[PDB]
């Protein structure tokens, strides 16, 4: 028997809106430690990693470890039925996933039973390594940058140095250059210059409502890490394969 109560329903609503546009089906791994999700996209080019620590939930119980195959679109539709102030309860047994929406400002109780599916997908393991550059900046600033450069080109050249960070794009209309100065903080070891598809960065930026800040971890010839810290509850990490150069 699994039962997790989250007072901040919005968190789960936001988490699902951040995922649904990148992946359609993902396996939700439940354990005594908390909720874990690790899935790569349809184009096999980006990877999502969600961690919601049990300590982040008001109530958390997990008798047996579950691996629920969820259709993220269906779960999103269900979560859309939850009010922005609702207390969300997740309850599952070792066939379906039950979502209970307790409304604070009313005597209304919503109870949804979502059909699960069996997911035989590619499981990939990410070793936590050290990056040559780690940029921390306002999530909104980042989302604006990515949206802006999309108007110019398809790829972004992220140049990270001691001074600041630079994002550049080129297209048929000309070229663009956004230079940020060191709130923006840089934990650089070696200067890095990497090229990434803006298409995918703009899916990652859908996690913007989850955090006021974003962190970009870069090391040469390795995937980029765009992390959104949830609220001491956990995080949501997006990995993006760099462009062949």
């Amino acid at each position: 028997m699994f039962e997790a109560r989250l007072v901040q329903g919005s968190i789960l609503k936001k988490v699902l809106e951040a995922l649904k546009d990148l992946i359609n089906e993902a396996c939700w791994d439940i354990s005594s430690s908390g909720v874990n999700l690790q899935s790569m996209d349809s184009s096999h080019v980006s990877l999502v990693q969600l961690t919601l620590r049990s300590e982040g939930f008001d109530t958390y119980r997990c008798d047996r470890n579950l691996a629920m195959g969820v259709n993220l679109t269906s779960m999103s539709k269900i979560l859309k039925c939850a009010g922005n102030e609702d207390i969300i309860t997740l309850r599952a047994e070792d066939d379906t996933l039950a979502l209970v929406f307790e409304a604070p400002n009313q005597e209304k109780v919503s109870d949804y039973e979502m059909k699960l599916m069996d997911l035989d997908v590619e499981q990939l393991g990410i070793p936590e390594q050290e990056y040559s550059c780690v940029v921390k900046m306002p999530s909104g600033e980042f989302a604006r940058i990515c949206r802006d450069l999309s108007h110019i080109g398809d790829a972004v050249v992220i140049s990270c140095a001691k001074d600041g960070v630079k994002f550049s794009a080129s297209g048929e209309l000309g070229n663009g250059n956004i230079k940020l100065s060191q709130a923006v903080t840089i934990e650089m070891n070696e200067p890095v210059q990497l090229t990434f598809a803006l298409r995918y960065l703009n899916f990652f930026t859908k996690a913007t409502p989850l955090s006021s800040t974003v962190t970009l971890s870069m090391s040469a010839d390795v995937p980029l890490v765009v992390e959104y810290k949830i609220a001491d509850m956990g995080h949501l990490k997006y990995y993006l394969a760099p462009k062949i150069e």
Binding site: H44, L47, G125, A155
Partner: peptide
């Protein structure tokens, strides 16, 4: 796009 990408599997 001039450059292509390697699969995320190639890294993991």
């Amino acid at each position: 796009d001039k450059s292509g990408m390697k699969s995320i599997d190639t890294f993991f």
